[PDB]
């Protein structure tokens, strides 16, 4: 990150070792669940591109994931260079491989600031979303409430898979409205259909509390 | 949060990356148990509205929960604007979407301080209470001691569900006084009725120690 | 690590007690999984050779692991002294046993910096790679998808073992391309062969989602 | 104004009775009712003999749409009941379509009827698209035909329909066909899908 | 603008229903849709009940042809979707037809539909031409009629079609007709083959 000096100069504060260790734990233990994206967003708050590259050096242990992460970063950099044909930050400068750290500080501290950090964070989040989409164990259509599974657990699994699949907004709305009811077990599906169309998730959860 | 400079000026200290990661872990892993409210209160100590919005960007992954969190925030903001018809902080300013950070510092550092942070924290806690009330797996009437469940575990589950359901104070007192005894298994229910009315929880727990 | 003083002098900041405790937890609890190398890389960011020796004092509890870690460090130091026949840092100085801390600061703060810390980190990572290669439970050829194991879990186990075995790059590419398909169960192996040669891991994972 | 042809009326009644309510009824109605006035539309609806429950639902939906029109809009301007043709006369209905700028009362009523018929078709479909699934020995061509008929009777949005087309067709097939479809993999076209799945 | 006749619409639906997708449906469509606009062609396709697999394939081929037209050609000009009528409107279609020189969106869409229907017929050929074998007692008349119906359905290239007519016709005949055809020899026209093979 970037922190004011005692005299006010913005000097780069290196990302702490335990923050990197936490990111490593998320990458290794979590097996690219849908929750690695909120955790990445939390850990990389205010991180510069050099810090983001330091973090991706930990996910570099995985071959395919790092490969398509860098390919998505390259695609986004090409898009930026198309939109954007000290020096102005180029697409490769945002990646923190051709630019130097002092240039990163100058870009992040400008008036208004040049959000190179947030741009690179968004690109990396797109790559992580693709990786998460690969690693999901089951598609949304596979999820179905068990004979005795409570509706809370089934809804949690359904929304986890929905976050994993990353469908469009309208498709997601239709899925949450209809496919959730369709996949529910018959005992709860009866109450879900009794509630009728337009049933908010609050009503669906309260009505099915303890049915299983 | 807000921290004094070396020269004494109150400069905003950004919420640490690991604090945000801890909040993300609470949101994702805990599945909105009743304990996410104490954990939110601990993590957001002294947080400004911008920090609270940064934290809610992590719970934004959930659709319905974030939706009714923002709707409860809007209701509370409307209530504030009804009560309240640099500039005085408006309801939307408390939400940290129309106000700027420097205005937040000015409001929090006033003499006496304008507790915008605590007000927004209370609103967010109301929203989280509603979300927790949805996600409870069973109602209070469902809880019942098992054939061999120790009374300590049964009381812990009962009080967890009681925190989840968030009934009124008088209703909560009646429930803890009577419904706890009623739902207990017969072997412990005999001792509970033998103790008679007005039995404090200490006496009930000590009398039933090791009965199961 | 090394941190600027209030007056700008680079004074050594001792590695925090909790960072050492985290490294101890990684060494003891993880049983030298393949993930101890990313975790070591994260924890030892910017660490000087004295800090690295302090960290290896924790892995010194294990006899054989510490023995071959120090033997690999000695081999790399001999290689450095062959390449390299205040004073210039010698191979033993990089190990942080003959050099003093102030010399380490002088070497790390030079223009351009003398990356003694990163060199020693690379040597220690080579030693840890050897130790991990010993402690792997099964060879790559042993891994095989179960009758009902999802392809995601099987791929995760396969890539964990691949990281453990540390084969050459071409051998690793051939293994991931062919041995992964060969070891898969017949139901998924049919789809893997149907995809044909040159199937990227993304296509293989998406095609086999939910087959088990 | 020209009266609706008796041949056209007989064709409309015949297709309604024969098809009961299949998804083709909506384009058939749109084709037959080209430029028709509300009087002619009411004639076409009233002339239907059977399926009087469905005709009652169509009347109810027309009433709801008329109420919504009256809510939004509280010769003379036409109200909802005027658009429905219950109150408007034939001369009045010739009016409102020649003012230029007009208010196409006939097309506005046709829209309400089309919405009602979409509801009727969606209910009359035998099963939902998610419930549609290939049999153990069903031919894949027949299963595709049933699936796309149900999808036509679905009433979902266009993006949702595209997602259904891409995913559910592969997902719902029996394992013998599903293995072949998975081997073909994503991005394949329906022609390749059945030519591979011909067996 | 002239709306399409209910008689013509019902004739198209009836011929599709009764002939399934025999090769004559392509010329029947070309005849009935003469001068039709994109809206009229969309009605013509949508009104077809059953064979929704084939209608889906026609829609997919329409989308592919629209995409190719868009790459070839990247009031507003017509896109492929506009030509297909999904995005454009009847007023814009009439304007494109009326422009000097005109942009024949109707003929382009008809060509796309004809390509789709050709693919449909090629698939819906019930049996491959290699399996058309004369029975022990079947007339050569019925045998060659079946053979040429299948050959029209297959829609193979000219050279392979000529080879088929030269070789498979005599190869697949029953022994009684096979001997006569072999004695007659190669380099023969169909009228010669049939008039020699009578009885």
Numbering used by the authors:
A (entry chain C), B (entry chain C), C (entry chain C): 1 to 85, 96 to 222
D (entry chain D), E (entry chain A): 12 to 85, 96 to 220
List passages from the publication reporting this PDB structure.
The mature HIV-1 capsid is composed of the capsid (CA) protein arranged in a conical lattice of hexamers and pentamers. CA assembles into a conical lattice formed by roughly 200 CA hexamers and exactly twelve CA pentamers, the latter of which facilitate lattice curvature and closure around the viral genome. Monomeric CA consists of two folded domains connected by a flexible linker: The N-terminal domain (NTD) faces the outer surface of the capsid, where it stabilizes the hexamer, while the C-terminal domain (CTD) forms dimeric interactions that link hexamers together. Here, we present cryoelectron microscopy structures of continuous regions of the capsid lattice containing both hexamers and pentamers.
Purified wild-type HIV-1 CA assembles efficiently into CLPs at pH 6.2 in the presence of the essential assembly cofactor IP6, which is coordinated within the CA hexamer pore by residues R18 and K25 in α-helix 1. These CLPs have a predominantly conical morphology resembling that of authentic HIV-1 capsids. We next sought to generate higher-resolution structures of the CLP pentamer using SPA cryo-EM. We focused our analysis on regions of the lattice containing pentamers and determined the structure of the pentamer surrounded by five hexamers (the “global” pentamer structure) to an estimated resolution of 3.6 Å. In accordance with our cryo-ET data, strong densities were present at known R18 and K25 IP6 binding sites in the hexamer and at the same sites in the pentamer, confirming molecular dynamics predictions of pentamer IP6 binding. Importantly, these SPA hexamer and pentamer structures are indistinguishable from those determined via cryo-ET and via an independent SPA study described in the accompanying manuscript, demonstrating that SPA is suitable for structural studies of complex CA lattices containing both hexamers and pentamers. As in isolated authentic capsids, pentamers in our CLPs were quite scarce, present at a pentamer to hexamer ratio of ~1:20. The structure of the pentamer within the capsid/CLP lattice differs significantly from published crystal structures of cross-linked pentamers and instead matches the structure of the pentamer within the virion.
